[PDB]
Design a protein around this ligand. Structure first.
Ligand SMILES: O=C(O)CN1C(=O)c2ccc(C(=O)O)cc2C1=O
Ligand SMILES: O=C(O)CN1C(=O)c2ccc(C(=O)O)cc2C1=O
Ligand SMILES: O=C(O)CN1C(=O)c2ccc(C(=O)O)cc2C1=O
Ligand SMILES: [Cl-]
Ligand SMILES: [Cl-]
Ligand SMILES: [Cl-]
Ligand SMILES: [Cl-]
Ligand SMILES: [Cl-]
Lengths: 75, 75, 75, 75
């Protein structure tokens, strides 16, 4: 679960479901500029060119981030 | 201009001023867990452990992001 | 796909097979410090703390790298 | 500091001198596709499009890497 979306109501970064994270990450690795996914009766588009998620039912925009692991890894 | 903060009023990622971007990036590269800066006579702290900017007067939290350069570089 | 090992004979970075790349990347995302994989019966270990692949039949150490895609993505 | 070159005699990644690391990192941040630097009587070019250091006299190719900081930062 490496992708996150920001919830401005709670003021915290939130995780995607395992399947939505996998849909987003597969599109990210394939070079697509955007990806759609469904969660709890809403369709969303993650726009990779702006790092913003758009709720396609309401139009609400929430920022997204990709977590990055340290290189090299610590012992 | 590698650091950005999300403005939920405009629905867009926003750039820091050149000096605030430099202040934030120098603290990021030094391994600090947070950094202080001011903009428009207001004080903020960027918390690197949560990737959020905190308005010190209101407590309002806005997300932040670091732009990343491709490795390897494209020709 | 995203992991590469350096071939000193040819002087080039080389891709892994889709299956070996998936094995390495799953272990990378799970926080493991190392991962074993095979190319047929030939055994290898990728040591994430040193970013080196050890050929477990010859003992030869080849460096490894993880490709990093640009954030945000270009249009 | 943050750039490293692979020493296949010892089988390990090695650091650049502080000045060579600064020269490489300044060219990296400026969008250049390559950078030249010296170490005593040795002359090198780091090719960012292939992540390889080339000895200008002999053509010997040593792979390079850029260390990456975790995002978000750990406490
Ligand atoms: O729709 C809203 O108000 C807020 N919201 C999102 O932005 C979002 C993104 C992904 C998932 C998921 O389960 O993967 C759930 C949600 C969710 O509830
Ligand atoms: O939260 C607010 O008060 C709104 N707001 C910010 O969050 C912020 C951060 C950076 C700069 C800058 O000039 O570098 C300006 C602003 C700004 O207008
Ligand atoms: O000459 C060798 O055996 C290998 N070798 C290099 O490729 C190299 C590159 C930069 C520096 C430095 O001091 O910045 C040191 C060396 C070094 O020792
Ligand atoms: Cl939403
Ligand atoms: Cl090598
Ligand atoms: Cl070998
Ligand atoms: Cl000499
Ligand atoms: Cl050399």
């Amino acid at each position: 679960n490496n992708w996150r979306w920001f919830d401005d109501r709670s003021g915290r970064w939130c995780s995607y479901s395992a399947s939505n994270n996998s849909t987003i990450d597969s599109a990210w690795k394939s070079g697509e500029t955007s990806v759609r996914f469904t969660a709890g009766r809403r369709r969303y588009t993650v726009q990779f060119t702006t790092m913003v998620q758009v709720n396609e039912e309401t139009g609400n925009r929430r920022p997204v981030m990709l977590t990055l692991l340290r290189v090299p890894r610590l012992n």
